[PDB]
Write a protein that binds this ligand. Structure first.
Ligand code: 7BW
Ligand code: CL
Ligand code: CL
Length: 371
């Protein structure tokens, strides 16, 4: 089971696609909810995501069918289409998923954030870095629900540098676009959700704390944080979760004025990557780095909760550290950082010491030597 949020607020979930096209925004929203008696949220909502995952793993599509059998009824503890908790303006996080992932696979993070009074928009990227995603060819297709699917692009070695950079720039634009959509809904612009879901978007009117915006993401999503910050000053700070730095252009490193927090796994990182993170540092800029002891790259994503301890460790979905312990640290340290750099008036400064890696399961900075 994917853990429930640790915060005081109940959590709701829904999906927004606007416009309906491959250039529209697709996101999963996690938000403080008024009610706590709704059905839980289906974790991986369509069979095609499992086919996507099968291609990402480099297996036959029939492994996709097997993955569906195993995981296709799994839920995540968020009240599907629950009304938004009224009477308060919430800060906003835009969240960016990893390569071969998609919008629904970081619910442990999204739910926890929402339970502390954030609205979280987990974008689904259309750069062919998602295992799968979908949209509609035209207005007619959107009405009848005739989905067009877009699957993960496999690269040749000679395409890697160039295409990963094209992808990270698209990802950043998608983050900025998702922000604009949410800010426009906040004002009260009518938006007809291309998905026919019983969550009225007008609830979001006057519900966003409009200057309190952050961008967070895992791996490819971590590079996306960085690209996004350099190009969109509306994002006040960023948190990169085990960032994969390879996609970034040489130009971006000196171009990130906002506070930036690197939260790393012990076992993912390597000198080339760490060197790139250190290129983000300058005397006038606020940077923080911590490393979670005993953790692996997948501790930041939901599949760390989806299997047992023995299978999970074999598949590199789990580390030596307990998955809930690990995500608690990442999520609490994130909260403290956000409160600091968004100027929130909550109690998240109780976790300030985690920003400095002061905890028995944290390493300050990095375990990686780069000399
Ligand atoms: C360094 C990379 C190749 C680049 C990158 O982004 N990486 C993270 C991928 O993270 C995934 C993928 C698929 C999933 F289903 C889940 C989950 N849950 C997580 C590895
Ligand atoms: Cl790893
Ligand atoms: Cl290296």
């Amino acid at each position: 089971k994917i853990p429930r949020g640790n915060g005081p607020y109940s959590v709701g979930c829904t999906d927004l696609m606007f416009d309906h096209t491959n250039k529209g925004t697709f996101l999963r929203l996690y938000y403080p909810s008024q009610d706590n008696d709704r059905l839980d949220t289906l974790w991986i909502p369509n069979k095609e995501y499992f086919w996507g995952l099968s291609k990402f793993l480099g297996t036959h599509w029939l492994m996709g069918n097997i993955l569906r059998l195993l995981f296709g009824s799994m839920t995540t503890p968020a009240n599907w289409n629950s009304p938004l908790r009224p009477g308060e303006k919430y800060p906003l996080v835009v969240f960016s998923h990893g390569l071969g992932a998609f919008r629904t696979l970081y619910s442990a993070i999204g739910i926890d954030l929402a339970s502390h009074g954030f609205i979280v928009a987990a974008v689904e990227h259309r750069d062919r870095s998602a295992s799968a995603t979908y949209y509609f060819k035209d207005q007619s297709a959107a009405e009848i629900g005739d989905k067009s699917w877009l699957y993960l692009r496999t690269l040749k070695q000679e395409e890697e540098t160039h295409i990963r950079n094209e992808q990270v720039r698209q990802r950043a634009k998608e983050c900025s676009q998702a922000l604009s959509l949410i800010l426009d809904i906040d004002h009260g612009k009518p938006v007809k959700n291309a998905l026919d879901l019983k969550f009225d978007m007008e609830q979001l009117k006057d519900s966003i704390d409009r200057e309190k915006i952050a961008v967070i993401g895992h791996s490819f999503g971590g590079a996306t944080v960085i690209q996004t910050l350099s190009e969109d000053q509306r994002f006040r700070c960023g948190i990169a979760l085990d960032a994969w730095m390879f996609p970034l252009g040489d130009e971006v490193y000196s171009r990130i004025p906002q506070p930036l927090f690197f939260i790393n796994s012990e076992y993912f990182q390597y000198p080339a990557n760490i060197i790139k993170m250190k290129k983000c540092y300058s005397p006038d800029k606020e940077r923080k780095m911590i490393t979670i002891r005993g953790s692996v790259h997948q501790n930041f994503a939901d599949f760390t909760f989806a299997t047992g301890k023995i299978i999970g460790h074999m598949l590199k979905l789990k580390g030596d550290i307990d998955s809930n312990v690990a995500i608690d640290l990442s999520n609490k340290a994130s909260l403290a950082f956000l409160q600091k750099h968004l100027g929130l008036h909550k109690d998240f400064d109780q976790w300030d010491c985690l920003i400095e890696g002061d905890d028995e399961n944290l390493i300050p900075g990095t375990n990686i030597n780069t000399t």
